[PDB]
Amino acid sequence: EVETFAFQAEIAQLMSLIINTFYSNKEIFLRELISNSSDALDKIRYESLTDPSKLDSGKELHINLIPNKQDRTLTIVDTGIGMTKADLINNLGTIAKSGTKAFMEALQAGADISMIGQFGVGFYSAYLVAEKVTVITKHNDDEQYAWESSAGGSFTVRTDTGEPMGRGTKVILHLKEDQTEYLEERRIKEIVKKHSQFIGYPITLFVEK
Ligand SMILES: CC1CC(=O)N(c2ccc(F)cc2F)C(=O)C1
């Protein structure tokens, strides 16, 4: 059972700009997704300070980066607070309407795409490198859901029957054919060292057979 939704017009406009603008510095997508994961991990950590049972769904707070060259996917996994179904539908827990407005007002005034995270919509930088993005998520207060979009103005949400995650979010980037450098170990390591050196959670880069 799959529900299909239209993006708000402003969010479709944001995605089109990310997809269509000539902009070579695409590697910042990974910094933005890792930053989102860190923010989600901070949230569950804070809740656990007054209610330890919030971690019954998983005590480890971490970020995993999982390249798969056979599937042409890069997956960013975190054990953060996760997202409810309502969060997913409401622009993956962001204030994306007002964030997009501010971001586009910054671009025509000199800013570049790399500053997207300062406007709270860094998730959408995934479309710098991905033709399709799948988001699997589990929040303590809801069931496990899968969000998906290839842009084009719509996204889907369905209950996820895949492998249970316990708690957190998995962002699966189905990479564009010409963006496979982001599956190479040395390239991922370089980006993490350059942009994510001060993230306060272990970032484990998985290797492939
Ligand atoms: C809490 C997560 C941690 C993790 O990393 N994984 C995972 C492991 C391998 C893989 F390919 C995809 C994953 F989401 C899980 O399933 C549970």
Distance CA 188, CA 206 (A): 10
Q: At which residue do the structure tokens 């979010």 appear?
A: 169
Q: Strands 203-205, 63-68: parallel, antiparallel or unpaired by DSSP?
A: parallel
Coil/strand/helix, residue 22:
coil
Strands (E), the chain: 3-6, 63-68, 73-78, 130-138, 145-149, 154-159, 168-175, 203-205
What is the residue extent of each domain of the chain?
3-201
Query: Pick from 33, 20, 19, 30: which is nearest to 184 by CA?
Result: 30
The CB of 134 under 6 Å from ligand 1? The reply is: no
Distance CA 141, CA 95 (A): 21
Distance in Å, CA 74 to ligand 1 centroid: 12
Using CA positions, which residue lies closest to atom 4 of ligand 1? 77
Using CA positions, which residue lies closest to atom 10 of ligand 1? 66
Contact 89, 72 (CB under 8 A): no
Rg (CA), the chain: 16
Distance CA 95, CA 92 (A): 9
Contact 28, 125 (CB under 8 A): yes
Distance CA 126, CA 27 (A): 10
Query: Could you confirm whether domain 3-201 is CATH 3.30.565.10?
Result: yes
Stated as kind and residue range, the H or E segment containing 47 is: helix 28-50
The CB of 64 under 6 Å from ligand 1? The reply is: yes
Q: Helices 28-50 and 185-195 meet at what angle, rounded to 10? A: 60
Distance CA 62, CA 160 (A): 22
